Design an enzyme around this catalytic site. Structure first.
Site, PDB file in Angstrom:
ATOM      1  CD  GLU A   8      33.575  47.061  43.607  1.00 11.90           C
ATOM      2  OE1 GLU A   8      34.651  47.034  43.085  1.00 11.90           O
ATOM      3  OE2 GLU A   8      32.538  47.119  42.706  1.00 11.90           O
ATOM      4  CB  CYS A  39      34.125  42.971  42.633  1.00 11.62           C
ATOM      5  SG  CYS A  39      35.869  43.869  42.278  1.00 11.62           S
ATOM      6  CB  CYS A  64      33.729  43.059  37.517  1.00 10.86           C
ATOM      7  SG  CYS A  64      35.006  42.878  38.719  1.00 10.86           S
ATOM      8  CG  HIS A  83      38.601  45.826  39.913  1.00 15.63           C
ATOM      9  ND1 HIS A  83      37.434  45.312  39.297  1.00 15.63           N
ATOM     10  CD2 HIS A  83      39.488  45.834  39.056  1.00 15.63           C
ATOM     11  CE1 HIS A  83      37.966  44.937  37.995  1.00 15.63           C
ATOM     12  NE2 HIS A  83      39.145  45.272  37.897  1.00 15.63           N
TER      13      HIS A  83
END
Ligand SMILES: [Cl-]
Ligand SMILES: [Cl-]
Ligand SMILES: [Zn+2]
Ligand SMILES: [Zn+2]
Lengths: 119, 119
Positions: free
Chosen positions: B62, B93, B90, B60
């Site tokens: 992050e 993260c 999320c 992701h």
């Protein structure tokens, strides 16, 4: 998820995850934590914490095993695989386990020796 | 975590996180999501989702930015850094942001346009 029974067949893979934890801490790769990803009794990835080796706080045992298994299989999903962890995953790693669609999780437990979770 | 005010100085960093979201989706690296990490008023990581590019469900925005920042600074903790995300992280993260010890998060929001959380 939902808790499941731990089987005799889970023993060898949980033990191997602990072996990875030993190999990792012994050589300085990271903390003593290991993870093994399996498909139909075949090991796809066997890893440990790599935070120090990779200078990466996201390189926990479970995240490392997922990255390796996905690269080896050339898939971003592992819905036919299961993961064994030397102890309970942290919140980040539970998130990675869910995002990766892994089917089952078995981890070492202090009160129950081992716990199995189906997703 | 405790909610904080969004500052005028946050604008240029949040905007660049959204620029990363555009660059990522445009070239097919992954979903339209971007993250920026700032150290001493300089961007040390400017990243977006790389799940498709890397074949990595943990990649992701992050997580990718945390990985790049730590490698550039040669640190596994980012306690002097702040992270900007194009939208709310999320659970995975958020776990990585906590593990990385980032001190502040700013992310794009729909009802309040932007939200700041201090750690
Ligand atoms: Cl770990
Ligand atoms: Cl993302
Ligand atoms: Zn973890
Ligand atoms: Zn995320």
């Amino acid at each position: 998820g939902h808790q499941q029974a731990v089987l005799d067949s889970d023993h060898k893979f949980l033990t191997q995850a602990v072996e990875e934890a030993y190999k990792g801490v012994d050589c300085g790769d990271g903390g003593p934590f290991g993870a093994v990803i399996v498909h139909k009794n075949e090991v796809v990835a066997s890893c440990h914490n790599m935070v120090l080796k990779y200078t990466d706080p996201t390189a926990h045992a479970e995240v490392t095993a997922i990255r390796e298994a996905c690269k080896k299989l050339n898939q971003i999903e592992l819905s036919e695989c299961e993961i064994y962890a030397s102890c309970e995953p942290c919140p980040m790693c539970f998130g990675a386990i869910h995002l990766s669609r892994l089917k089952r999780l078995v981890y070492g437990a202090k009160a129950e020796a081992a716990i199995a979770i189906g997703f």
